[PDB]
Amino acid sequence: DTYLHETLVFDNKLSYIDNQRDTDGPAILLLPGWCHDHRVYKYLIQELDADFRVIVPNWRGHGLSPSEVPDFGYQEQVKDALEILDQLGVETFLPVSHSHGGWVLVELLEQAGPERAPRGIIMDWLMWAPKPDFAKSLTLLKDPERWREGTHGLFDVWLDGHDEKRVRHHLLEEMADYGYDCWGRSGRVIEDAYGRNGSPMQMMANLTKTRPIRHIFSQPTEPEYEKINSDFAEQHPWFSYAKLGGPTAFPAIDVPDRAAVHIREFATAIRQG
């Protein structure tokens, strides 16, 4: 895109999107998951471009030119993101994550605190601890002999039987340059995050300062999954959710207008106190 930059962040050259829009805060900080980059957000960036400053960091070894890097996890993703924000002179921001980018978002909320990061939106992020199929996928990602098979199994799940042209392009073309260095790492980091924090829901509830967080998701589509979101929301005044009804696990791509209205809602709320 026109908006793509690169800067040195501690030891690493990281790319990032910044539309440099001069306007009222908060900045919208779109956070990628593992082994993809800002390209996942291109449609969402267009929905928001005009009214908001939009920043998208890419993680170590991530970007248009993936590279091998030393092992790191979500704690480092958080430090990386804040340093980029510091370099840009961004104070207040609304973080928005995709899938396991949520580990970065929640830890970012903790580290940045409620004045800098008063709310967050998490998109399509498995709220319960891994079921057998996903646990199996993580096991495959970690295997140097079966990692690609692992990614293919996830692509099947994420597409959910749909010939969704834009999401297919993202998975098959826009993730194609990522190798075992990333996918193995993602398997280890995500597996460790669940192991260490229990679940995304446990981690959020354990925040020192709880804050408005909304989970917007299209998948999984089963009633049992909606129920754990409804139950969590019943218990925690600060949590909400919305089932977006898109075909794939990538609503930022396949229902960008819907993702956008939820983001605008939270940004509008922040602007009113």
Ligand SMILES: Cc1[nH]c2ccccc2c(=O)c1O
């Ligand atoms: C972009 C992205 N990357 C991942 C890497 C490993 C395991 C799960 C994920 C995931 O769910 C997701 O959406």
Ligand SMILES: [K+]
């Ligand atoms: K609630």
